[PDB]
Amino acid sequence: SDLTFCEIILMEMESHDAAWPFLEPVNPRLVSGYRRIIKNPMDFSTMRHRLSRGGYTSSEEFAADALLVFDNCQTFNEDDSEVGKAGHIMRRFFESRWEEFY
Numbered sequence: 001s002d003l004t005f006c007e008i009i010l011m012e013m014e015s016h017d018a019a020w021p022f023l024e025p026v027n028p029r030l031v032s033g034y035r036r037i038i039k040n041p042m043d044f045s046t047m048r049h050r051l052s053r054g055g056y057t058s059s060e061e062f063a064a065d066a067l068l069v070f071d072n073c074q075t076f077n078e079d080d081s082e083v084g085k086a087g088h089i090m091r092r093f094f095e096s097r098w099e100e101f102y
Protein backbone atom coordinates (compact mmCIF):
# COMPACT_ATOMS: atom_id res chain seq x y z
CA SER A 1 0.00 0.00 0.00
CA ASP A 2 2.89 2.33 0.81
CA LEU A 3 4.36 1.18 -2.51
CA THR A 4 1.09 1.81 -4.38
CA PHE A 5 1.41 5.55 -3.75
CA CYS A 6 5.02 5.48 -4.97
CA GLU A 7 3.97 3.83 -8.24
CA ILE A 8 1.39 6.59 -8.78
CA ILE A 9 3.81 9.40 -7.92
CA LEU A 10 6.64 7.96 -10.00
CA MET A 11 4.34 7.40 -12.98
CA GLU A 12 3.16 11.01 -12.76
CA MET A 13 6.70 12.36 -12.45
CA GLU A 14 7.93 10.25 -15.39
CA SER A 15 5.23 11.71 -17.67
CA HIS A 16 5.51 15.33 -16.46
CA ASP A 17 6.49 18.01 -19.02
CA ALA A 18 9.27 19.17 -16.66
CA ALA A 19 10.74 15.66 -16.16
CA TRP A 20 13.05 15.81 -19.17
CA PRO A 21 16.31 16.49 -17.19
CA PHE A 22 15.64 13.61 -14.80
CA LEU A 23 14.52 10.67 -16.94
CA GLU A 24 18.01 9.13 -17.33
CA PRO A 25 21.27 9.27 -15.33
CA VAL A 26 23.46 12.28 -16.06
CA ASN A 27 26.38 11.21 -18.26
CA PRO A 28 29.50 12.66 -16.56
CA ARG A 29 31.42 12.37 -19.83
CA LEU A 30 29.08 15.05 -21.22
CA VAL A 31 28.82 17.31 -18.14
CA SER A 32 32.09 18.82 -16.96
CA GLY A 33 32.50 18.73 -13.18
CA TYR A 34 29.42 16.62 -12.45
CA ARG A 35 31.34 13.67 -11.04
CA ARG A 36 33.37 16.06 -8.85
CA ILE A 37 30.37 17.92 -7.40
CA ILE A 38 27.56 15.34 -7.14
CA LYS A 39 28.49 12.52 -4.76
CA ASN A 40 25.24 10.51 -5.03
CA PRO A 41 23.58 10.78 -8.46
CA MET A 42 19.94 9.84 -8.77
CA ASP A 43 17.32 9.95 -11.51
CA PHE A 44 13.83 8.68 -12.29
CA SER A 45 14.90 5.61 -14.26
CA THR A 46 17.14 4.50 -11.39
CA MET A 47 14.11 4.86 -9.11
CA ARG A 48 11.91 2.98 -11.60
CA HIS A 49 14.45 0.15 -11.78
CA ARG A 50 14.73 -0.05 -7.99
CA LEU A 51 10.94 -0.03 -7.67
CA SER A 52 10.64 -2.79 -10.29
CA ARG A 53 12.94 -5.25 -8.52
CA GLY A 54 11.28 -4.56 -5.16
CA GLY A 55 14.31 -2.68 -3.80
CA TYR A 56 12.33 -0.16 -1.72
CA THR A 57 11.41 -1.37 1.75
CA SER A 58 9.31 1.69 2.65
CA SER A 59 7.93 4.86 1.11
CA GLU A 60 10.42 6.93 3.13
CA GLU A 61 13.24 5.33 1.14
CA PHE A 62 11.45 6.19 -2.10
CA ALA A 63 11.02 9.82 -1.04
CA ALA A 64 14.69 10.05 -0.03
CA ASP A 65 15.69 9.18 -3.61
CA ALA A 66 13.18 11.65 -5.05
CA LEU A 67 14.48 14.46 -2.85
CA LEU A 68 18.05 13.52 -3.79
CA VAL A 69 17.20 14.09 -7.47
CA PHE A 70 16.16 17.65 -6.65
CA ASP A 71 18.95 18.33 -4.14
CA ASN A 72 21.50 17.31 -6.80
CA CYS A 73 19.68 19.51 -9.32
CA GLN A 74 19.89 22.57 -7.07
CA THR A 75 23.50 21.80 -6.13
CA PHE A 76 24.71 21.68 -9.71
CA ASN A 77 22.38 23.96 -11.71
CA GLU A 78 21.62 27.65 -11.36
CA ASP A 79 18.05 28.36 -10.27
CA ASP A 80 17.51 30.29 -13.53
CA SER A 81 19.03 27.65 -15.82
CA GLU A 82 16.71 25.54 -17.97
CA VAL A 83 17.45 22.43 -15.90
CA GLY A 84 17.20 24.37 -12.64
CA LYS A 85 13.81 25.78 -13.62
CA ALA A 86 12.54 22.31 -14.55
CA GLY A 87 13.85 20.91 -11.27
CA HIS A 88 11.93 23.50 -9.25
CA ILE A 89 8.71 22.55 -11.04
CA MET A 90 9.39 18.85 -10.45
CA ARG A 91 10.41 19.38 -6.82
CA ARG A 92 7.25 21.35 -6.04
CA PHE A 93 5.16 18.75 -7.87
CA PHE A 94 6.69 15.92 -5.83
CA GLU A 95 6.28 17.73 -2.51
CA SER A 96 2.64 18.56 -3.21
CA ARG A 97 1.73 15.04 -4.38
CA TRP A 98 3.60 13.43 -1.49
CA GLU A 99 1.69 15.64 0.95
CA GLU A 100 -1.76 14.77 -0.39
CA PHE A 101 -0.96 11.09 0.15
CA TYR A 102 0.49 11.46 3.67
Ligand SMILES: CCc1c(-c2csc(N3CCNC[C@@H]3C(=O)NCC(C)(C)C)n2)[nH]c(C)c1C(C)=O
Binds near residue numbers: 034
Ligand atom coordinates in the same frame (compact mmCIF):
# COMPACT_ATOMS: atom_id res chain seq x y z
C1 LIG B 1 22.36 20.08 -18.31
C2 LIG B 1 22.60 18.57 -18.11
C3 LIG B 1 21.55 17.85 -17.16
C4 LIG B 1 20.44 17.13 -17.60
C5 LIG B 1 19.95 16.90 -18.90
C6 LIG B 1 19.24 15.73 -19.20
S1 LIG B 1 18.78 15.88 -20.88
C7 LIG B 1 19.53 17.44 -21.06
N1 LIG B 1 19.55 18.25 -22.32
C8 LIG B 1 18.83 17.88 -23.58
C9 LIG B 1 18.74 18.91 -24.73
N2 LIG B 1 19.36 20.19 -24.54
C10 LIG B 1 19.61 20.59 -23.21
C11 LIG B 1 20.35 19.52 -22.38
C12 LIG B 1 21.74 19.11 -22.98
O1 LIG B 1 21.85 18.06 -23.51
N3 LIG B 1 22.91 19.96 -22.86
C13 LIG B 1 24.15 19.45 -23.47
C14 LIG B 1 25.12 18.76 -22.45
C15 LIG B 1 25.32 19.68 -21.24
C16 LIG B 1 24.54 17.41 -21.99
C17 LIG B 1 26.46 18.50 -23.16
N4 LIG B 1 20.08 17.79 -19.91
N5 LIG B 1 19.78 16.66 -16.53
C18 LIG B 1 20.39 16.99 -15.39
C19 LIG B 1 19.89 16.59 -14.02
C20 LIG B 1 21.51 17.75 -15.71
C21 LIG B 1 22.48 18.32 -14.65
C22 LIG B 1 23.90 18.79 -15.04
O2 LIG B 1 22.15 18.37 -13.51
Ligand SMILES: [Mg+2]
Binds near residue numbers: 067
Ligand atom coordinates in the same frame (compact mmCIF):
# COMPACT_ATOMS: atom_id res chain seq x y z
MG1 LIG C 1 15.07 18.23 2.23
